[PDB]
Amino acid sequence: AEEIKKQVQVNVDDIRAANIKLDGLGRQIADISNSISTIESRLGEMDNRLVGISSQVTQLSNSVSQNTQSISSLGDRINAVEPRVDSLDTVTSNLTGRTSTLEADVGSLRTELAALTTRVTTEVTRLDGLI
Amino acid sequence: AEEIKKQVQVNVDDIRAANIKLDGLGRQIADISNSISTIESRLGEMDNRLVGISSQVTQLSNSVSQNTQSISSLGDRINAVEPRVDSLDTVTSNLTGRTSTLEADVGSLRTELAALTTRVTTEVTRLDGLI
Amino acid sequence: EEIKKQVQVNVDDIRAANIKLDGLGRQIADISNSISTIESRLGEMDNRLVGISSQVTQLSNSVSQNTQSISSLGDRINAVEPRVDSLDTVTSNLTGRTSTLEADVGSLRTELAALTTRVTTEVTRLDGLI
Ligand SMILES: [Cl-]
Ligand SMILES: [Cl-]
């Protein structure tokens, strides 16, 4: 009987102690629920950042695509200009030769015309002297 | 004895209440385990998005390097073309002056040849009249 | 007695509850480890997003430099093109004028040879009459 009463007291105190440890586990679960709520907020902010970065990459891709198209257009324009400059080098070089040839020919014709002018003066003077 | 029997019955009750509280905590742990599983899958979907973005940035970086090189090549071609066009403006300016001078010189030679033609007619007429 | 038996059953049931409580205590410790790893993964992912953003910012500066260089090359080609069109016009006009000069000079050369012959023929004729 004395043994019974002693053990029943121990059981009262052990049941109360177990119930306090169960309340402690409930507080640990509440703290885990707060960690999970915060993790979920962080996952939402990271989702927002990933949307923002993806938009920046998409926009940058479009600007690079526009630059590749502008470079192709400038390439077409320089491709068209280069052979026109090569052609003009040939045209002006051939014109230069023809201008030099004309300057030599006109100089020769002027000298020959001046020699014929003096020949006319000489011959008319001579004929006048015989008459 | 009646006091003992009553406290043993209350302990039986309290041990059953404790076991109901333990069952409730196990259900809460099962709910947390589910949330953790879903968070771990979300960590994987975000890892996938980051892989996709990183691959887009690598590709874009290659395109930008290709464009910077294409721009330097076009720059070298325009740098080469510009002084060739400046040289052609110099050649053509100098040929323009030379062509104008030839047109004035040929006009003068034509007038002078017509004057000598007239002079030959005048002097021959005069000499014939004296004979 | 029935009391003594129930008190012993209660001892054993309280120990079974403490074992189960200790098991839930270990499961909560394991969940706390899972949370710490998840937090570490979020911190690494935040860093990766910062590193990617920095690379995109640097790449965007290079793209801006290229767009600017493209506008400068555009200005240079815009200036060249009409100068090449002008040179085609000017050289075409000079070519036409040079062919006219060559025809005129050819004509003058023939006319000068005819006047040279005429001076010889007329001087011969006059000499013959004297
Ligand atoms: Cl008891
Ligand atoms: Cl670019």
In Å, how far from its chain's centre is CA A113? Answer: 69
Nearest chain B residue (CA) to C28: B29
Quote the tokens at residue C27.
């499961």
Q: Is the dihedral of CA A112, A116, A121, A122 positive or negative?
A: positive
Nearest listed ligand to the Cα of residue B63:
2
Experimental method: X-ray
Check chain A for breaks (C–N over 2.5 Å) and list the residue before each, or none: none
Could you tell me how many CB contacts below 8 A there are between chain A and chain C? 123
Give the one of B49, B102, B127 whose C-beta lies nearest to A102's C-beta.
Answer: B102
The nearest CA of chain B is from the CA of A54 a distance in Å of 7
What span, in angstroms and rounded, lies between the C-alpha atoms of A93 and A99? Answer: 10
Residues 6+ apart with CB under 8 A from B49: A50, A54
Encoded tokens for C28:
């909560």
- CA atoms of C97 and C10, how far apart (whole Å): 129
Q: In the numeric block, which tokens belong to residue C21?
A: 């409580």
Instruction: Give me the numbers of helices (H) and strands (E) for chain A, helices first please.
Output: 1, 0
* C12 inside 8 A of chain A by CB: no
Which ligand has the nearest atom to the CA of C3? 1
Copy the structure tokens of residue C18. 């403490």
CA proximity to C99, closest of A110, A88, B103: B103
Q: Rounded to the nearest whole angstrom, what is the distance from the C-alpha of residue A3 to the centroid of ligand 1?
A: 12
Distance from CA of A60 to the nearest CA of C (A): 7
Would you mind telling me the total number of residues written for chain C in this entry? 130
Q: Residues B57, B63, B66, B67: is their CA dihedral positive or negative?
A: negative
Residue C88: CB atoms within 10 Å: 13
Written as six digits, the tokens of C43 are 């911190």
Which residue type, as a one-letter code, is found at position B117? T
Distance (Å, whole) CA A92 – CA A76: 25
CB contact under 8 Å between B36 and C38, yes or no, is yes
- Cα–Cα dist B34/A88, whole Å: 80
> Resolution to 1 decimal, in Å?
1.4
Distance CA A39, CA A37 (A): 6
